[PDB]
């Protein structure tokens, strides 16, 4: 298994907010290729992101981040001047840490965590009407020695839906079983939510795996979330379960029956995946 | 009361779901004792458990199960055709398995914890309809060495009930000054709840106990829970605080007001309680 | 410094009395009673004689959270320990240390951030009391524990933070490299979830890492719901400087309604940039 390396140098990357289809709103990496959840954000405890922001929106907006250390110029708040406004471009800077003793011989926590960004001053001074439309997007802070997955996936309960999307229309992921998927679990909006994998579960800590047989954390395959709530975890694709579509949905029982489902697709090596409908 | 001994034992049961009185539906051991939560399955890690499930209801009944190993073919939903048929028998299969180092170094997790088992598929395709009803219960898996309890008792908060009772009738439930208590905590519905003991607390981890002093988990007495968790935890009956009638309840107020609300009444070795009159509860 | 072992037999004495226009809050003294109440402060070991005094026009109580306490100090109407109008009494908690039972488990200690509040104004789980105020903040500290320069609760009680209007904080105020504390309670009938601005804490105890193999996450936001109690120490600026750093409900709809708070960084010379 592939480990982070330690971190710090310092990274920049191009944001832009724009108009998608039925007028949602995302974050990308080039105009015209927005998305939603916005594009993965990758960095090592100790790197330093410059985030070149361009707002092509006719209303202000912003990008806060959790987790990270940032100065309250990168806040990304009106009350902190930290939006932009309609055409305007601004640079954030997100940095990070490593844990270490303090000197009053306290130990700092490093950045290291699942974490997220969003808008902030869309529809209200809160990013309401940002969060709603789409404007979110995930970031994870490796430490030094963290297990690399082989796959990332998203997946936010924004309100009712998943990712933004209509009900019952996932979205469903695929691996191979045996594969290391990495899974960043985010919520945002008016309601608390329940998330349930079916056929996996995970350890509610900061990697979502177990230090070893010394990690008191409960496992666990249900966690509730409220707005704001982020975690993750990587599991090993049908470890001890074999092949097959595992669903994925929250578990508050309305939301499951309303479309709050997705499936974890684990294919066989063959790519088939048994007694499932494709 | 002794230690779990390490698991690796093919065991059966009959697991059957039955219509009880007043329009409930429930799991049993037996036909004619269904109950609401259903029995208690306890499971030591690597304990392989054939599930011989009976539906004798007249719609298509499932049992999903939390946690535990199965095989997409006992995943109980429509979706995966393992529901079974008004009249019909399927049997289902849970593994578990122990904690171990994987050949890339890492730590898989084990089997162990506080988990259960429910409908999917009563009513709607994710078993609302058989949830609401009283199609649940509780999966306990053991890791070798874990202590043992007295006794075990399961609290249900669905929906607004506890254990699909009327509103302020329980249940209660007895111990002794110095017995060691578990309980089995598991949420189920539309609602978020939070759960509080009187007089009690327990470590935030998966045995409700903390390992020693190197544990950081937090010590609480009131925990917020949403449908399928479920969680935990074993505490020494009126530890350093006494007989009395200790009460349980949601915290969440209106709901208290409502009536998820119980009592874990401690006697003293003599058998009383003092000061306990119910018609003051 | 840190927190010494405990042992002491401390009294108090607390009252129960009306605020202007339907609050009710717990006060030291007369007169002066506080919305979230005053904070109780021990040592593991500690005992505390609560000596309460009910001012109001009906039956009032005080339940604890986490602390031991005998059923006569239950602080329910169902086991009889509440207090009639005008009357006293004195509540009992005690503390204990962390140690080995007989049985050779490991007794969890009575050290972490909980709450004490009415449990029979309005309805006899204290529905109308919590609504109107009467609740506030217990440390039990542990020894060693590392104490903070200043401590501040906050309690999300439905959608006000300590029964104040919307939009009005509270504001607490700090300078870079303090070691602050927060106490976060919830009451009422709505999950929350607590979010801070330009900080993060562990999700144990202390709201810090014991040391690095410590696999608490580490977060900025928690959902929490009706008698919920935790706590952390941050400190202030640490490695983000100052400024007017926001906290608030991360539920949209009560942030704009307006569970809203500065916790106000000054720079050694008192000033906030930006502010
Ligand atoms: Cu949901
Ligand atoms: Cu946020
Ligand atoms: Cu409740
Ligand atoms: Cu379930
Ligand atoms: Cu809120
Ligand atoms: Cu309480």
Redesign the interface.
Same mark, same amino acid.
């Given at each position: 298994?592939g480990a982070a390396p330690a971190g710090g140098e310092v990274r920049r990357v191009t944001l832009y907010a724009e108009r998608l289809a039925g007028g949602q709103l995302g974050y990308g990496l080039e105009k015209g290729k927005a998305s939603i959840p916005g594009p993965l954000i990758e960095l090592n405890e100790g790197d330093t992101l410059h985030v070149e922001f361009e707002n092509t929106l006719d209303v202000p907006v912003s990008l806060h981040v959790?987790?990270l250390?940032?100065?309250?110029?990168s806040?990304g708040?009106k009350?902190?001047?930290s939006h932009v406004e309609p055409g305007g471009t601004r640079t954030y800077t997100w940095?990070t840490?490593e844990?270490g003793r303090?000197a009053?011989?306290?130990?700092?926590?490093?950045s290291?965590?699942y974490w997220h960004y969003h808008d902030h001053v869309v529809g209200?001074?809160?990013?309401?009407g940002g969060?709603?439309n789409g404007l979110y997007g995930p970031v994870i802070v490796r430490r030094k020695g963290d297990?690399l997955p082989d796959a990332t996936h998203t997946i936010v309960f924004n309100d009712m839906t998943i990712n933004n999307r209509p009900a019952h229309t996932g979205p469903n992921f695929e691996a191979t079983v045996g594969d290391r998927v990495e899974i960043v679990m985010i919520t945002?909006?008016?309601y608390?939510?329940?998330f349930?994998m079916?056929?996996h579960?995970? /350890?509610?800590?900061?990697?979502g795996?177990?230090?070893?047989?010394? !990690?008191?954390?409960? *496992?666990?395959?249900?966690?509730?979330?409220?707005?704001?709530?982020?975690?993750g975890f990587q599991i090993?694709a049908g470890?001890?379960?074999?092949?097959? /579509?595992?669903?994925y949905?929250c578990?508050?029982?309305?939301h499951? !029956?309303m479309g709050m *489902?997705g499936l974890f697709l684990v294919k066989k090596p063959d790519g088939t995946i048994?007694?499932?409908d494709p």
């Open positions: 298994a959790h987790g250390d940032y100065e309250i110029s806040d708040t009350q902190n001047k940095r840490h844990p303090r009053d011989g306290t130990w700092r926590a490093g290291a965590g209200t001074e809160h990013g309401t969060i709603r297990v945002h909006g008016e608390y939510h329940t349930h079916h056929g579960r995970w /350890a509610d800590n900061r990697t795996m177990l230090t070893g047989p010394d !990690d008191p954390s409960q *496992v666990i395959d249900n966690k509730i979330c409220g707005p704001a709530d982020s975690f090993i470890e001890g379960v074999g092949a097959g /579509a595992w669903m949905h578990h508050v029982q309305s499951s !029956d *489902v048994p007694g499932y």
